[PDB]
Structure formats: structure tokens, C-alpha cells
Design a protein around this ligand. Structure first.
Ligand SMILES: [Mg+2]
Ligand SMILES: [Mg+2]
Ligand SMILES: [Mg+2]
Ligand SMILES: [Mg+2]
Ligand SMILES: [Mg+2]
Ligand SMILES: [Mg+2]
Ligand SMILES: [Mg+2]
Ligand SMILES: [Mg+2]
Ligand SMILES: [Mg+2]
Ligand SMILES: [Mg+2]
Ligand SMILES: [Mg+2]
Ligand SMILES: [Mg+2]
Ligand SMILES: [Mg+2]
Ligand SMILES: [Mg+2]
Ligand SMILES: [Mg+2]
Ligand SMILES: [Mg+2]
Ligand SMILES: [Mg+2]
Ligand SMILES: [Mg+2]
Ligand code: NA
Ligand code: NA
Ligand code: NA
Lengths: 53, 123, 80, 50, 54, 120, 53
RNA sequence: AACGUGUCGCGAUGGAUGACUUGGCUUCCUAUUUCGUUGAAGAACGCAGCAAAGUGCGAUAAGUGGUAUCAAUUGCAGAAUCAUUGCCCAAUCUUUGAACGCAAACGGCGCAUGGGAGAAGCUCGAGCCAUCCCCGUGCAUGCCACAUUUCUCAGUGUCG
RNA sequence: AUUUCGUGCCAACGGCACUCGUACACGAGUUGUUCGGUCACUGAGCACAACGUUACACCGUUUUGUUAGGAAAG
RNA sequence: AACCCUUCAUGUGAGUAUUGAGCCAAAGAAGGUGUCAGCCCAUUACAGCCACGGAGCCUACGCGCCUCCUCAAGAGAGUAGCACUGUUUGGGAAUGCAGUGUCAAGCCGGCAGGUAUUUGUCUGCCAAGGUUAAAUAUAGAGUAGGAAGACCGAUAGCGAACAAGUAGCGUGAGCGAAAGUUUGAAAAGUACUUUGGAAAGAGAGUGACAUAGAACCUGAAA
RNA sequence: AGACCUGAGUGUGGCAGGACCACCCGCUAAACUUAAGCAUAUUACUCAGCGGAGGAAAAGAAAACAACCGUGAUUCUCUCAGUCAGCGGCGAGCGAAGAGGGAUUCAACUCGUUGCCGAAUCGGGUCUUAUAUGACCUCGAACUGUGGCA
């Protein structure tokens, strides 16, 4: 039930990054998936390592 | 882990802080769940979830206690939220009160006083 | 051509799912349910089908609130 | 086709998740009576429409 | 005087007033072993009467 | 109070008993030495207790109680076991009415029970 | 009083090469077309049902 | 001769019979005995470490709280009075439904009021934050009483 | 309504066959300021409100410029 | 221990069974436990003992204090009645009711008194406003408990002893099953060798019994 | 300009709808069937349809029976009684009441009207530990009559 604007603000609060685009889809099993592109000043690989991926 | 006896004394600000730390710790556990975890790390998810529910229980009760005290006066008696009023069945809330059901007229009062019940026995 | 050939001429649909009961009985064109009579406030109940009545009556579902209030009555609304 | 309401899409999603076998560890429980999922569905046998 | 003689398996207790035929003739067959207390024995003349005595 | 004139009702109450009821139903007699000391006929069994089996294939065997499998109405005793085909060792269940208690794991709550049941 | 008689069975009539007993309606149940309502039928009503008076 | 027929011993196919029974049916009795706008009954969607159905529960989601008892639960994990178990006072209670802001094969669209976030801009990292976005509450129709410090009106109705 | 994709698999199924498969198993896949719909139009039509009728609304009227004996504009 | 003889073997689950001694009973009561149990377990009682209890109900109409309170007229009007029509009743020259028309009395009143009319007595009541426990129903309802049965015993008894108003069928209103997981006391649910791609076969092993091997007690007929 | 009457808008506090429906109360209302045919009759003032409650409902305190040496609200039970009561193509069929023995029962009350009074009544606000059957105030309702005594 979340929308794009709420997702973008939640990401910054949780991980302290700035984004440039959010794309969403609803999966066939009912879940919602989001692709989030970070700004060039932020490294997605560095953030994923901090997350624990 | 938390104990309900310790959460009782803490203030609202302290309880709200402890809620945020528990929610953050739960989020990290879900991330590891997507990867391979191990049995020990898979446990304590229920422990964190239980602790969150205990903090919310204390927070809600304190709020409801404050509202009851605020409206604890005969002045308002109608601004009180319906959820705070005593809930019985729908029929019991409309039936008749104790004082309304036993009302007697002036003639009824005098007759009852003049001819009271007696206990007599025979022989 | 009224048999096998005519089965290939059936294209649309008369009924869809009902918002109040399910059951796939909501007439699309007439905008009413053939099972619960929605959007009429009263639902259907006929004594020429006691089998159908016993399928829908209370106790065939969850009774989410009735369980609570029945226990409160048994304990004469003990409080605090 | 392409069009379907989100409510209808959610109903189909629940039926997809139901179409799966019984876990192996369920059969080893004390006093078990379940051997296989009796409510399996195939898209060519039974329709269920929606 | 029943308390001592209850719990004894195979012993039946009865009251001289309200004698039961289903107990006196089990299965329809007559002739049952009956033990009489002295007080109950002396009451049989009054309860059932005699010949030429109601 | 499970036993009733209704056999159908008595059997339903026994086999659908909750966990706290099954604790009482799984009781064992005390030994002669314990009876002479505590003056109690029998007590419910618990883990870390010492028992001696009196009825069945294991007669005269002694051991310490390892588990109280209430879901299977049995107790597990160490050194009372069987070998599998692979060589693994598995415990064998024994009904609690076939054993007797020789040593009790004392506790402040268990001591309260013994004083409750003291006939003298 | 309702035992064995809670169906909507009726006779198929003559000309269908089957006996004239009432038969259960519907399809897809293995109960469809089965004999019903008779004291000789499986799941039917017994002869002279017992009463409490 | 082969095929075919018949009797006996053994073996298949099939699921009768007997013995079992936490189920049904029938009769009788006892209560601090009878739902809902303080949102019912029903209907949908979700929740377990491994969890399809069923059961319990509702984002506090196989449960939080109180109480009595005490060592279990168990398929494998895993934790070690506090669990489990029985009962019950305090709570939570998603989307709907009489369904009631307006609609509806739409997880759609408002008005009023109070909050929240804010990567533009402004002022001195901080404070104000426009557009956009999120959340709480109120807003159906009819009928009854009141305007208690006695609200605003309309009639070539009757007077003045 | 997952039949799509990859890997594996041949018990049952594809009236013969299978090493193949729309079969079985385990995991994956559907990205929008501009595309279609709603936002935001009227049509053949429908029927909430109001009124009337009916023992009983679960009935009738409701686009020929248009509701209602009709004070419906905030 | 299977056509007969010889050698060599292998075979009896769990004592609630039998026998002999006791003991309890204000308790002999019917459930569980590897076979038929008063004394292995749980139960079986007050001829009782503890904690909790916010509303309600009962008790010198329970018991104190303050406050309050107390000790000539008339009688139901579009009503009753009457006519016609319809329905209803055992009610028959009309039992009750409904519609329309007509429409009272109270200065010797009105209604009833089971055959119509007019007249006079006698008897009993006083319509057209309202409230009210107990003894009664529960003929397909509930919420919690209890008690049972000369009943059925898995094609029977509820459709349903089982994930049953489920699977499945129909555009829909609706229709609606089959199926005891009853192996064994206990999974001790067949390690290992050998042939086979696998499924399986031949040996070995567990178990009192494997012709008790997993939809596994018994296992009939065609 | 100001009253009264009639009628609107808004605000404050409340209530109705839906479910259950075995039993109970009010309406509406068949045919199969029997009559060896069938139309009045019967099935039946039943089934199906609509509305409304409770823990029970409904009834209930004489404009009642009787004709006696008189009973005394309602409900229910045995009986009266398948009736030498009665209705009916007088066919098929149908069909009660009073009395009598019981269950229950300290069971009974009061609006209007008549006579004597005439806001002594109600709502709201404040005080008394109190939304008191108390007190004070009230150009609020009520004299087109609320209350109290016989
Ligand atoms: Mg998109
Ligand atoms: Mg045709
Ligand atoms: Mg066509
Ligand atoms: Mg059409
Ligand atoms: Mg479709
Ligand atoms: Mg049957
Ligand atoms: Mg083939
Ligand atoms: Mg009345
Ligand atoms: Mg059956
Ligand atoms: Mg059946
Ligand atoms: Mg209603
Ligand atoms: Mg009700
Ligand atoms: Mg005829
Ligand atoms: Mg004939
Ligand atoms: Mg004819
Ligand atoms: Mg009444
Ligand atoms: Mg009749
Ligand atoms: Mg008056
Ligand atoms: Na139009
Ligand atoms: Na008249
Ligand atoms: Na009816």
C-alpha cells in the first residue's frame, strides 16, 4: 500500500542516501518490488556491504 | 529481552526511544533471513517481536489512564469518547436505571407506609 | 446446430463476484446479487430451502465478537 | 488478457501460493494423518474462473 | 441402619414398607433368600393383613 | 474425576486431557522406604527422579528419569534403550504406573506438596 | 423425522432402460443418478421409521 | 495329440465377516441466560524458524496483559517463576458488510480541522519551509428534546 | 491465469513412442510525468433522494429542459 | 512340528490368568495401564479447608451517621347499535370480524340471559383508556454446564466417526460425495553383501508373529 | 416596532435500520388429497409469502357464569366429550362450553372524568461528598392544564 514518494523518504531515513528514481511493480504473488537508483555521489555497492549483503 | 515490571516506571520519552531500537534490530534480522542464517540467529526473532508488543501494551495503557483522569468529573459527562465509556450489551445500556425503575408516586409512598408486610405464624 | 456448435457462441458472462458474499452471483447488467440480494439492505431468506438457510446462518463463520460478548455475560461483566 | 482488477489479481495470487505440496517434516509428527495435499489444482483440469 | 451393610458386593437392602416385586422375584422366578430383622418381621401382619382381618 | 458412568464421556476426557491434567494422571507409587519417611502413597513423576521398573521386559532396572513425554503418555529412563539398525541408540517409553519412585528431586514447591499429602 | 429424505430426487420415468426408483439430481459427485428415498436404496429412508409415541 | 471339462494342495484378485468405537440419534435437568452505529452476523486478505489445508489470531497478528500451578514443548531446530497448561478483569483488533462524505469488475475522488516528512527557496550546520506526498478526527437520511448566559429567519395568517 | 524462463527428472499423464513435454520438482521473471484506464465528457439507458401507493416496499415516477404542493443555491 | 524311518536343528511376548496367603471398605464406581485389577494410577466425602470477588440478588422489609419524606355530582361517541355485502364459527331467522350507508340512550339508563317479532317482569354485570409475577411452549434456535438409554454400530447412525457443507457440478437459484491411517506393546519402519540405469529381486537382520512391511488386524465369495 | 400563530435553516445531546427466528404475536393465503365422478364441503382458518418481540410470549382483574342450598381476574391439566350439544350435496365429514378434582396464587393496581385547590409540576444552571422525589435562581416549557388531596 506504499507509494513512490513514501518509499523515497523512507529509504533516506533508514540508510542515509539520496536517490534519483524509484520504480515499482506488484509481483504475481502479491508482493510489491521497488528498484531504487542512488545518486552518483553515493555508492550502491558500499551501501549493500554496510547492510550486510 | 524486556520485563513488564521494569517498563512500568519508565516515561513516555524513554519508552518511545526503546521502541525504535527494537524495531531497528528486527529489520537487520530480516535481512539476514534472506541470506543463509543458521539456527541460533533465526531464533530471537520471536524474542524481539515479543518485546515490541510489551512496549506498546504499556504505552497504550498509560494513555488510556490519563484520559480517564482528565474526564473524571461530572462537568463533561458527554464529551467523553464512547470507547472510554463502560461497554455492556446494547439492550443493557437502554433498559432502565436502578433509580428510574423504582419510582413511586406520593400516594404509593403513603399506602406502603400505612400497610406494611408482617410475619405472623399461627397457633 | 443447437448442440456442440452452439457451445462455441457463448462469449461473455452473466455473473461476477459479489462484494457482500462472494459466490459469483452478482448480475453484471442488473447490478444486483442473486444469492444475497445486494445492494438491498436485507438479504435473501426463504423457508422453502432450509438447507440453504443452514448454510449461511450464524455460527457457520467466525463469530469474532459473539465469542467475546458471550463470555462477558457468563461472568456478569466483571471489571477492573 | 492484459486487464484485470487488483482485487481479482490478489485472489489469483492466493491460489498460486496454495498450490504446493505438504512439507516433509509434517508427516513425521506424532499422530499425523496427512499424506498429500488433497486440494491440488491444475489450470487445465479445473477452472475456478474469477 | 444402612451404612455398614452398603459397599458389600452381592448384598441387597430393602425397607419393609414399599417392598418391590422386581426385587422379590428377579427375572420372574419366585423364591429369594431373605433375611428379616426382628422389627420388620413383626410389621408384616399390619402391612398385609391376615385372613378375616383387613 | 475423569471416571464416570458414561464410558464414552470418560474416554473422551482422558484422551483429550490438557497438559496440566496429564501431569496428575502420570503418577507413580513411592518405594517402601520413602513411604515410611514421608507417609505418602504416591506422587506425580518429574525429571531428574530415580525410578525402578516393576512390570514388563525391563524388570528390576533402575535409572534416572530423562523426559516426561506427556504427548505419548510415557517417560524416558536412561540405560533403558534399544539399538536401531544403524547402531544408533534410542530411548524406550514406559508407562508411569509400571514403575516406582526411589529418589525424589527435592524442591521448596515439592516439599509443600508432601506436607499437603502427609496422612499423619 | 428427516433422516434419509433430505434430497431432491425424482424418478427418471420409463423409456430410459432403468428401474423407476427416484434418483438423485446433479452431477460430478458419484452420487448423481443414484437411487434415493426407498427402504431398499443405499442411504435411503428405512421402512416405518420409529416414533416416540 | 492339442483345446476344453472335473476333483484336490498351494498362490493371485477383491474387500465381505467378526471383534473394536474420542461419532450419531433419542429423552431429562440446572443458570447472576439472549447480538448490533461503543459498528453485529456474514464475506475477503494476511500472521509460525522450517507452515499446503485445518485450528488460533489481526501489522502488539499460532499472540501482549492478569491470575493459579510448576518444568516442560517435542518432527528437527532453538532458548533456559519466566515458559507451557487452564481460567479471566486490561488492551490491540487489516479491507468490507445495516455501512452511513461521494462512488465502485476503480485497493478511486472530496470538503473542514490537527499533525508529519521535505534533496527547491529564504534567514542566521541550524531555524522557517512553497508545489507534491502521508496520517488522525468530523461530514448519510429520518425522527425526538434543547438553543437555558434563550441562535438566525419567512408569511396580501391574526392583532397592534 | 503462471501454461513464460533456467536447471533437473521419467513413477503416473500426452489412447503408439520418448532420452521430448503446456507433465513432475526446485528456483526465477512483469520497472512508465508522456502507453491503456481513473483523474475529467456525454449516449441508448439505470434508479439514490423526494413524493405517492401498498395489510406489507422487496412497487411506481425519475431527459419532450430535467426531481419534489416544491422554502433543495452557503 | 504333515507319505514313513535316521541324524542334526529351531520354536513359546507382556501375568489384570491359575493356586495359596492376607488387607480396606461411611470408599465394590463403570476410566487408564503390553491379557479378565477394591489394594499399580487416577477417581469415590464433607455424615470439610483455603485464598479472590468490581456490579447485581438474598438476610430482624440485614446494621450505624447525615439529609429528606410520611403518619353532592360523575364514570371513556362517528362509540355501541341497525341495513346491505364479504369472510369466519359447532353457533343453527345470522358466533366474531371488515367495508360503505345510517347513527344512539343516560326522566322510569345500557349490555347479557344459545328460535325471529311487539309488550311487561326477574337475574347478573357496567363496554368503547392503561400496567401486572406464578403455574404453560420451545415441533430443524442459542450461551455454559450436567444426567442418561432393553437405540445405530462404518452400504448402519446426521449428508458429514476422517483438513464435510469439504472436493466436485451448474450462467444462476441451487445440488453435493467417497473415505475407520484398525502395522505393532514398543518404529525396534529392514544396517549390511550381491545383481540391476532405476523400480526391484536374492541373502542378512528386528520382532512372540513379517503369509503383522506401511492405506500393513481378521482376510469370505465371484 | 413589537407580539402571537403557523413554518424553515444551523448547532448541541440522543434514537431507528441489520442479524437470529425452535417456541410466541399480527396479517396474507393454496393446491395435491377425500367425497370411489365433481362444483358446496374436506385437506385448512394448514404449507408457501410479509411484518414484530422475549427469556418466554400472549392473556388477565367481569358490560363473566348460572337459574343453584348459588360461584367470583388470567393461564394450564384430568374430565366434561368423538358428545342420544350442535354444523353438514344432513353425504364424506366436522365439533366446543358451564359445572367437578387439581397446578399456581400475602395478586392486585390507576389515567380520564366528578368535587376541593390551581404551577405547589417539568427542563436547565448552582450548592449540599449528591445529573438527591433536598434547597436557590430561571421575561425556558406549561393555564388550549403539569401536579396534590377525596
Ligand atoms: Mg507501473
Ligand atoms: Mg433449445
Ligand atoms: Mg450470440
Ligand atoms: Mg445481458
Ligand atoms: Mg477473467
Ligand atoms: Mg440412512
Ligand atoms: Mg502413450
Ligand atoms: Mg397487556
Ligand atoms: Mg456414512
Ligand atoms: Mg452418506
Ligand atoms: Mg428487525
Ligand atoms: Mg433475539
Ligand atoms: Mg375424487
Ligand atoms: Mg379414486
Ligand atoms: Mg379428478
Ligand atoms: Mg406481557
Ligand atoms: Mg374446521
Ligand atoms: Mg390531571
Ligand atoms: Na440519458
Ligand atoms: Na359505528
Ligand atoms: Na408459514
Amino acid at each position: 500500500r506504499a507509494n513512490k514518494t513514501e518509499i523515497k523518504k523512507a529509504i533516506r531515513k533508514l540508510y542515509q542516501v539520496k536517490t534519483v528514481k524509484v520504480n515499482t511493480l506488484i509481483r504475481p504473488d502479491g508482493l510489491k518490488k521497488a528498484y531504487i537508483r542512488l545518486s552518483a555521489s553515493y555508492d550502491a555497492l558500499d551501501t549493500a556491504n554496510k547492510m550486510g549483503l | 529481552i524486556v520485563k513488564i515490571r521494569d517498563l512500568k516506571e519508565k516515561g513516555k520519552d524513554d519508552l518511545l526511544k526503546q521502541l525504535s531500537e527494537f524495531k531497528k534490530e528486527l529489520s537487520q534480522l530480516r535481512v539476514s533471513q534472506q541470506m543463509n542464517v543458521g539456527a541460533a540467529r533465526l531464533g530471537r526473532i520471536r524474542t524481539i517481536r515479543k518485546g515490541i508488543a510489551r512496549i506498546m501494551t504499556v504505552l497504550n495503557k498509560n494513555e488510556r489512564e490519563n484520559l480517564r483522569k482528565f474526564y473524571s468529573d461530572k462537568k463533561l459527562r458527554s464529551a467523553k469518547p464512547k470507547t472510554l465509556r463502560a461497554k455492556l450489551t446494547h439492550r443493557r445500556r437502554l433498559a432502565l436505571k436502578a433509580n428510574e425503575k423504582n419510582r413511586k408516586t406520593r400516594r404509593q409512598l403513603r399506602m406502603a407506609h400505612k400497610f406494611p408486610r408482617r410475619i405472623y405464624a399461627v397457633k | 446446430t443447437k448442440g456442440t456448435t452452439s457451445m462455441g457462441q457463448r462469449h461473455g458472462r452473466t455473473h461476477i463476484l459479489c462484494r457482500r458474499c462472494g459466490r459469483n452471483a452478482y448480475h453484471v447488467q442488473w447490478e444486483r446479487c442473486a444469492a444475497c440480494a445486494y445492494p438491498r439492505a436485507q438479504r435473501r431468506r426463504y423457508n422453502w430451502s432450509v438447507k440453504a438457510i443452514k448454510r449461511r446462518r450464524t455460527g457457520t463463520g467466525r463469530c469474532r465478537y459473539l465469542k467475546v460478548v458471550h463470555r462477558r455475560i457468563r461472568n456478569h461483566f466483571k471489571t477492573d | 488478457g492484459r486487464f484485470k482488477p487488483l482485487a481479482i489479481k490478489k485472489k489469483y495470487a492466493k491460489k498460486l501460493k496454495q498450490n504446493r505440496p505438504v512439507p516433509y517434516w509434517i508427516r513425521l509428527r506424532t499422530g499425523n494423518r496427512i499424506k498429500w495435499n488433497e486440494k491440488r489444482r491444475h489450470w487445465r483440469r479445473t477452472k475456478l474462473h474469477y | 441402619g444402612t451404612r455398614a451393610f452398603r459397599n458389600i458386593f452381592g448384598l441387597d437392602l430393602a425397607n419393609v414398607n414399599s417392598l418391590n416385586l422386581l426385587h422379590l422375584a428377579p427375572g420372574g422366578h419366585v423364591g429369594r433368600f431373605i433375611i428379616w430383622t426382628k422389627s420388620a418381621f413383626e410389621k408384616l401382619d399390619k402391612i398385609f393383613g391376615t385372613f378375616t382381618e383387613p | 474425576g475423569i471416571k464416570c458412568r458414561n464410558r464414552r464421556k470418560a474416554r473422551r476426557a482422558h484422551f483429550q486431557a490438557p497438559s496440566h491434567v496429564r501431569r496428575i494422571l502420570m503418577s507413580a507409587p513411592l518405594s517402601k522406604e520413602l513411604r515410611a519417611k514421608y507417609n505418602v502413597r504416591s506422587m506425580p513423576v518429574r525429571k531428574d527422579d530415580e525410578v525402578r521398573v516393576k512390570r514388563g521386559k525391563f524388570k528390576g532396572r533402575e535409572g534416572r528419569v530423562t523426559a516426561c513425554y506427556r504427548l505419548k503418555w510415557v517417560i524416558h529412563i536412561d540405560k533403558v534403550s534399544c539399538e536401531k539398525a544403524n547402531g544408533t541408540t534410542v530411548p524406550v517409553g514406559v508407562h508411569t504406573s509400571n514403575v516406582e519412585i526411589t529418589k525424589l528431586k527435592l524442591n521448596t514447591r515439592r516439599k509443600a506438596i508432601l506436607e499437603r499429602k502427609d496422612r499423619s | 423425522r428427516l433422516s434419509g429424505m433430505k434430497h431432491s430426487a425424482e424418478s427418471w420415468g420409463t423409456g430410459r432402460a432403468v428401474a423407476r426408483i427416484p434418483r438423485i439430481h446433479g452431477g460430478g459427485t458419484s452420487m448423481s443418478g443414484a437411487g434415493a428415498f426407498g427402504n431398499m436404496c443405499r442411504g435411503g429412508r428405512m421402512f416405518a421409521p420409529t416414533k416416540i409415541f
